[PDB]
Symmetry: C3
Subunit: 250 residues, 3 copies
Amino acid sequence: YRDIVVKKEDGFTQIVLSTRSTEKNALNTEVIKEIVNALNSAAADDSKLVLFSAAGSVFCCGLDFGYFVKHLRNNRNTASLEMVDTIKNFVNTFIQFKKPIVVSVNGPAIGLGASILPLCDLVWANEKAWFQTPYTTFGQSPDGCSSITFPKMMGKASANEMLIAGRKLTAREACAKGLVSQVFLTGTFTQEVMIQIKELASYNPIVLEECKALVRCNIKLELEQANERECEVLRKIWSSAQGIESMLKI
Amino acid sequence: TYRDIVVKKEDGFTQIVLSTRSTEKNALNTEVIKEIVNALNSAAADDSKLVLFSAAGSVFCCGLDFGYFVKHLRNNRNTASLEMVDTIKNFVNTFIQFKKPIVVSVNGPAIGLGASILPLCDLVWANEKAWFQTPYTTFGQSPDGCSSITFPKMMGKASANEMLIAGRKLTAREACAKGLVSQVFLTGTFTQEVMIQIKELASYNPIVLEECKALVRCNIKLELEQANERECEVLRKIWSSAQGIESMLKI
Amino acid sequence: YRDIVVKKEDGFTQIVLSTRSTEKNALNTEVIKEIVNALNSAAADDSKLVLFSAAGSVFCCGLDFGYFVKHLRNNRNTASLEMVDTIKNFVNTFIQFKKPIVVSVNGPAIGLGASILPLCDLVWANEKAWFQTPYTTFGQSPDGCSSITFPKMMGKASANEMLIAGRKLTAREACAKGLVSQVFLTGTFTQEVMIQIKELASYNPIVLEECKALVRCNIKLELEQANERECEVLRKIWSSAQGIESMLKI
Ligand SMILES: [Cl-]
Ligand SMILES: [Cl-]
Ligand SMILES: [Cl-]
């Protein structure tokens, strides 16, 4: 791996976002493929859970648009179709993943950076982290199943303040909305996380998987279907003159 | 031309102002419902990217005008309840089918049917002094506007029932904590803040706006139509009963 | 009876948990069979609604596992089936119940004492009450349909802070999450519940039965299947060696 660090500790595996092929941990095709491959290996591991974290001032600014736009500019529906396929499979990996994923957010989560969070099982955020899905600004419709997961958590109209209006949520605001599930003090953030993760790793593996399987059970199909619907709209938008024009805006 | 509402076709948005003259406090009667349906239908058809739905006076909407309805019900109960139920069902259905985003601006109390329609819109912008109430149990009715499912969806069932059964009032800030309101504004800058935020929304791409709304409502639109049918059948039963009329007369 | 008091007042029946057979209103087979009997009776009453309350320092500390681990020790195959069957029928009684159930929580609600709350219609809690489902310390999968009701009400990530992380919620934070529906000041708690309950019981019977029917019809089938799936998983955990090893800790 070039763009992530994977550390298999006592009963859990840390996947750390730490990109060098991109800035601010943006996701290009190759970063996404390392994540998918690291997750696939943790699934085959004897890890009980995954900690998903990031290094740097930003957690994840989401899709690297500079990278995708260059590909989209030799033409056409092709680059469009490939990029959606990549996003589709990325989101699905999270949807299908059987072990708990605890996400540690120590900086802004933006776009696909924020929209995959509700696909995880616990979301622990530094009080300094913030969250946004500036879709209307990007000129796209929702990704990461957010068209269903934001309304389920916070209700339609609060979901829309993020999906339609593009508003930033502080960590505390996102937690009252259900997007973050626990807020931590900045000074002691990383040690607070490790202590609580080692506690979680100390529990029984069968009860952790069975609890996730029972919460997973009814929601999985809905998420697969949301992802499919989201991807179909992105295919349409990203192969339109309009959609391409929008992605080109910085 | 409209008697009870004002429609403003603005820069990339349509503005529908509830401003009734034939009822008090923006109460809804048959005639006010039909104008609103009509205005929505026209906004659906023209090149507005979105609708701003608002009100004038000291209340947003006090819901159904029961003084107006109990008079017809008193004359022919079987026939008048079918009518009442048809117009409400179709009022609600108009909001369920509307494909463009509806932003509602609430600048005073929203009561009964005036609160229960809010969850069918897309953003709910409230002045800090607005409050919200569905006193169905006080009125002597069951839920309307799909609130039987939209309130449990946004709040959880028990919190839903504090509004649906217990008849409790929510300030704008506590309605915001429960998902019914989505943004709260200081009273001093309410309408100017609303107007700037609406123009920035109207600056966005129409296809992005409508696709996003379509995606969000996809797995729920059927559920809403079905709730509205269920609700209105119970309402038909209650408003055609001796107890129902009596309850309505005491409002 | 022995462990409960039934009080049939003007338009409502009150069921009071005050256990002598267990400590802190914990549930054994006998306490559970009494609650089921009271409920079935109340369903046949002319009462418009049920008030469910408790006496003592705690509301309900959940399953009495010191009682259960005992009978599981010798006959480790069929004592589990017996235990899960009692639990499944206890939960089903709430799922099926047709009149409103208001629950009054005047102290901690722990484990199955907490997870049955979402099955009732209103949950009035003293500000001093707190809520916990410490399943992963118990070493069990969720019970009471918490696998679907906690996620539905508060979002999946917030739900897992309870389901997986075993976190305690005060009455106020349980109210922000949708689990409690009204918090009361402690000095007048009792007075206020009785006043508000007689208020509710003064409403038209037809309209109370119908708001409950309109809320209930969309969700009951889901609740029944969650119960079935939760019970199956508990069959397995509680009959396994590591399960019984878990059940031993007070
Ligand atoms: Cl950096
Ligand atoms: Cl006025
Ligand atoms: Cl005691």
